[PDB]
Amino acid sequence: KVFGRCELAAAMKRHGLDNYRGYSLGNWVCAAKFESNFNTQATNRNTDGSTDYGILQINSRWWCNDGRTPGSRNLCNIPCSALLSSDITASVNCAKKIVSDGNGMNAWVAWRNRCKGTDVQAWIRGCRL
């Protein structure tokens, strides 16, 4: 699924991401935008043996198990394929776990690069939340 920003915003909001650990919804939507272009199926198979999965491009080294990544910690306790679901719950849950595991949203390089310091509310602006 390729979300629309507002649809994603609403989904993320239903999942409690707005202001999760102080990150407004737009941040999450922005992160998704730049991580995956809102594509729940996004994968980025890295040269480092990990892959980034799903709408938030969560990486398989620490966060989810794809069985093939060295150093797997599977801190989200999920198979990475769960992060490729059309529903965002697993990605959200894992995103929450990423933050709960002492990360900010700087855990997402696309957030750090493309959302941090930006008008992230643009990503939820004009949406029905």
Rg result: 13 Å
| SSE run | HHEEEHH
Helix vs. strand class = mainly alpha
End-to-end separation in angstroms reads 19 Å
Number of helices: 4
CATH class: Mainly Alpha
CATH architecture: Orthogonal Bundle
Based on DSSP secondary structure assignment, what is the total number of beta strands?
3
The structural domain count equals: 1
CATH topology: Lysozyme
Question: Which range best describes the helical content: under 10%, 10-25%, 25-40%, 40-55%, 55-70% or over 70%?
Answer: 25-40%
The main β sheet shows up as: 3 strands, antiparallel
What order do the strands of the largest sheet run in, or round the barrel if closed? Answer: 1-2-3
Strand content: 5-15%
Shape category: globular
Detailed description of the structure:
The protein is mostly helical and 129 residues long. It has a single domain, classed as Lysozyme. 32% of the residues lie in helices and 6% in strands. It has four helices and three strands. It is globular and about 40 Å long. InterPro entries: Glyco_hydro_22, Glyco_hydro_22_CS, Glyco_hydro_22_lys, Lysozyme-like_dom_sf. It holds the Pfam family Lys. This is Lysozyme C.
Short description:
This is Lysozyme C. It is built from four helices and three strands; from the N terminus they run H-H-E-E-E-H-H.
